[PDB]
Amino acid sequence: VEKFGDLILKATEPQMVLFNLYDDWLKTISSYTAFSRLILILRALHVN
Amino acid sequence: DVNPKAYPLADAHLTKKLLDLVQQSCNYKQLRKGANEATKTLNRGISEFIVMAADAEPLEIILHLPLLCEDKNVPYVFVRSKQALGRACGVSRPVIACSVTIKEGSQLKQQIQSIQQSIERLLV
Amino acid sequence: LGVYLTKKEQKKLRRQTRREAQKELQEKVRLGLMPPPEPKVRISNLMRVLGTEAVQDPTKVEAHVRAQMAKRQKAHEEANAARKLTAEQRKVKKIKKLKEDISQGVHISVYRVRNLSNPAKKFKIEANAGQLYLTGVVVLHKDVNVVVVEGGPKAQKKFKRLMLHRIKNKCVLVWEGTAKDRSFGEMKFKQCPTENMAREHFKKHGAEHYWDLALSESVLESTD
RNA sequence: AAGG
RNA sequence: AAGGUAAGUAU
RNA sequence: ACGAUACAGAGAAGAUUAGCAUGGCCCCUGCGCAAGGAUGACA
RNA sequence: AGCUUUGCGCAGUGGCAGUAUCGUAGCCAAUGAGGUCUAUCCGAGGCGCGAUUAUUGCUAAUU
């Protein structure tokens, strides 16, 4: 994902960064569905 | 008919009201079943009124309860059936004497007082 | 002459009715008249029921599970609401439980109040008697205030409790009893500056003796 | 399938 | 001398 | 009358496995039924 | 007119435990079941027998 790659490449010193991969998902679906959707998205990103 | 020894016998309407109050008292944990428990409640002065059946054979096994009621100033009444009285108490077995105990703050206090007034004006 | 049921009897009845219903449903399913029941699925039950399906289509499976849960909730609400007392029907049950049968007899209570000047108290008495179907009369004098109340024993008890504890000069019950038939209508709150016409009005209904008792008791209290 |  | 038999189906 | 042959040979173990609903118990919520409690309201 | 108590149903959600849940044209039981403690006091089921994966169904696999 560009938002992580550009951030890491642009970084000059180590630092702890907190993100949220369930940005607007818990407002409408359970965390069980959010995790499965995110893992599907990540699998698709890795594969192609 | 019924034994004349049971002179304070209730009519049908009062019988229904008494059985309803006995069932409500059983639901409120305010009832004692049996002649022995009625005697115990009378001796401890925690009895509102005593309901006893007119089919007890012999009836003399509960005729001591009116005397204890008079001594302790507690109203008493006779119902025509020992099987319906037992059912009202929540027990399938016949009951020949049930005692409604005194519980402060109970929601049945007004009904208990009304039944006491009805009984105390029916004996004669 | 109804027969009550013990708690064991009630448990037996409920258990055997539920068992009969379950057996009937199972027979309907086996015979083919009813489709087999689908497993009940919740959010915590989603993966345990369809993990294979939840992996491929997470949002679709989530939507299906939530649709089943919403269907169950909708069925529950429809059952509850379908069997709900109409707003007018609620009044009909209430308007009837408070209507005692005065065919057998009417219970009459007579009250004497030292002072009844407060309009709020007048409205309280009038409304409470009207709701409880307590037909009667209120006669206002300098000291005597005869409140004849006739109706049902439950309404009589409620109204006696009303002026004994809910409403505050003092309130005294003159005489509580029964008569064959009613003799007064709705609350009127007649004003009676003098005793003669108050007695005449009570004689119109044929209940002057209530006025006599109230006047005599008030005189005795004044002398005491 | 073969032996006493 | 034993306590050391596989149970078979075919030919 | 065995045995030799050809074949099989794990020649000693219900080893089962998950899901849901019922059932028991204990609340909570809604609705119905039958009873009841306490209180408020001026012309 | 609201509010609220008790009991009974009907459902919904949730929690807990499977050494336990039922069955009683068997017997006994408030005319007293059962009592180690509190006994001139306690007050309700007990026992025997039967069912069982210590309630019972479907569903999915392998078969």
Curated annotation (Swiss-Prot), chain A:
Subunit structure: Part of the U5 snRNP complex. Component of the U4/U6-U5 tri-snRNP complex composed of the U4, U6 and U5 snRNAs and at least PRPF3, PRPF4, PRPF6, PRPF8, PRPF31, SNRNP200, TXNL4A, SNRNP40, DDX23, CD2BP2, PPIH, SNU13, EFTUD2, SART1 and USP39. Component of the U5.U4atac/U6atac snRNP complexes in U12-dependent spliceosomes. Within the minor spliceosome, which acts on U12-type introns, interacts with PPIL2 and RBM48. Core component of U2-type precatalytic, catalytic and postcatalytic spliceosomal complexes. Found in a mRNA splicing-dependent exon junction complex (EJC) with SRRM1.
Domain notes: The MPN (JAB/Mov34) domain mediates interaction with TSSC4 and SNRNP200. Has structural similarity with deubiquitinating enzymes, but lacks the residues that would bind the catalytic metal ion. Contains a region with structural similarity to reverse transcriptase, presenting the classical thumb, fingers and palm architecture, but lacks enzyme activity, since the essential metal-binding residues are not conserved.
Lineage: Eukaryota, Metazoa, Chordata, Craniata, Vertebrata
Organism per entry: Homo sapiens
Subcellular location: Nucleus; Nucleus speckle
Protein name from the UniProt record: Pre-mRNA-processing-splicing factor 8
Disease: Retinitis pigmentosa 13: A retinal dystrophy belonging to the group of pigmentary retinopathies. Retinitis pigmentosa is characterized by retinal pigment deposits visible on fundus examination and primary loss of rod photoreceptor cells followed by secondary loss of cone photoreceptors. Patients typically have night vision blindness and loss of midperipheral visual field. As their condition progresses, they lose their far peripheral visual field and eventually central vision as well.
First and last residues shown, out of full length: 1899 to 1946 of 2335
Tissue: Widely expressed.
Swiss-Prot record, chain B:
GO CC annotation terms, alphabetical: box C/D methylation guide snoRNP complex; dense fibrillar component; nucleolus; nucleoplasm; nucleus; precatalytic spliceosome; protein-containing complex; small-subunit processome
Example GO BP: mRNA splicing, via spliceosome
Organ and tissue specificity: Ubiquitous.
Organism of derivation: Homo sapiens (Human)
Sequence segments annotated as region (Interaction with U4 snRNA and U4atac snRNA): 32-44
Stored Pfam families: Ribosomal_L7Ae
Cellular compartments annotated: Nucleus; Nucleus, Nucleolus
Residue numbers of Phosphoserine PTMs: 118
Annotated site residue numbers, Interaction with U4 snRNA and U4atac snRNA: 57, 82
Phylogenetic classification of the source organism: Eukaryota, Metazoa, Chordata, Craniata, Vertebrata
CDD domains, A to Z: SNU13 (cd21104)
Family matches, as Gene3D superfamilies: 3.30.1330.30
Chain spans, region Important for U4 snRNA-binding: 92-124
SUPFAM superfamilies in UniProt: L30e-like
Residues with PTM N6-acetyllysine: 17
Protein name in the entry: NHP2-like protein 1
Main location group: nucleus
Keywords, in A-Z order: Acetylation, mRNA processing, mRNA splicing, Nucleus, Phosphoprotein, Ribonucleoprotein, RNA-binding, Spliceosome
Gene Ontology molecular functions: ATPase binding; box C/D sno(s)RNA binding; RNA binding; U3 snoRNA binding; U4 snRNA binding; U4atac snRNA binding
Keyword tRNA processing: no
PROSITE patterns in the cross-refs: RIBOSOMAL_L7AE
Consequence when changing residue 34 to K: Abolishes U4 snRNA-binding
Swiss-Prot record, chain C:
Cell compartments where the protein resides: Nucleus; Nucleus speckle
Highest taxon of the lineage: Eukaryota
Impact noted for substituting residue 59 to M: In RP18; reduces phosphorylation; impairs binding to PRPF4; impairs self-association; affects interaction with the U4/U5/U6 tri-snRNP complex; does not affect global pre-mRNA splicing
Modifications made to the protein after synthesis: Ubiquitinated. Undergoes 'Lys-63'-linked polyubiquitination by PRPF19 and deubiquitination by USP4. 'Lys-63'-linked ubiquitination increases the affinity for PRPF8 and may regulate the assembly of the U4/U6-U5 tri-snRNP complex.
Distribution of this protein across tissues and organs: Highly expressed in retina, liver, kidney and blood. Detected at lower levels in heart and brain.
Location of region: Mediates interaction with SART3: 1-115
Subunit details: Component of the precatalytic spliceosome (spliceosome B complex). Component of the U4/U6-U5 tri-snRNP complex, a building block of the precatalytic spliceosome (spliceosome B complex). The U4/U6-U5 tri-snRNP complex is composed of the U4, U6 and U5 snRNAs and at least PRPF3, PRPF4, PRPF6, PRPF8, PRPF31, SNRNP200, TXNL4A, SNRNP40, SNRPB, SNRPD1, SNRPD2, SNRPD3, SNRPE, SNRPF, SNRPG, DDX23, CD2BP2, PPIH, SNU13, EFTUD2, SART1 and USP39, plus LSM2, LSM3, LSM4, LSM5, LSM6, LSM7 and LSM8. Interacts directly with PRPF4.
Function: Plays a role in pre-mRNA splicing as component of the U4/U6-U5 tri-snRNP complex that is involved in spliceosome assembly, and as component of the precatalytic spliceosome (spliceosome B complex).
Protein name as catalogued: U4/U6 small nuclear ribonucleoprotein Prp3
Source organism (scientific name): Homo sapiens (Human)
Name of the coding gene: PRPF3
Residue span relative to the full protein: 436 to 683 of 683
